[PDB]
Amino acid sequence: FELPLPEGWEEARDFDGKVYYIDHRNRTTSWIDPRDRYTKPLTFADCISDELPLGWEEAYDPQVGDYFIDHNTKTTQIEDPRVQWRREQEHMLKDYLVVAQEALSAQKEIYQVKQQRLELAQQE
């Protein structure tokens, strides 16, 4: 479907003849189509589309419910592969993060040791 302009917006033309958008409610103007927020990626890493990738299929079993077929690998599974992707993507980063924290924690420690050790000597 083609979205219509939200309530109380207006198109206008520049001298140039370019289109811009008048938002009367807020007494503002813009080069940006307001419905672009729904139809445009919001980042060079964003995709609006959540299509299953080539070879995957949605399926419904009356006993078991929704499930997914992977024709690439002659496989079926319950879990949305998209969801499991995002999960194990995140789990990858979330512990890649935690090792870096472990690293600094140690290296900060290895120099705190050179001081703390020199300290106990006085206690003699």
Binding site: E10, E11, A12, R13, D14, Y20, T28
Partner: peptide, 18 residues
């Protein structure tokens, strides 16, 4: 080369071709 400089749209207060 050099790109054309940024142009803002006509400000709200003022005349508009609609």
């Amino acid at each position: 080369d050099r790109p054309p400089p940024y142009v803002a749209p006509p400000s709200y207060e003022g005349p508009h071709r609609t």
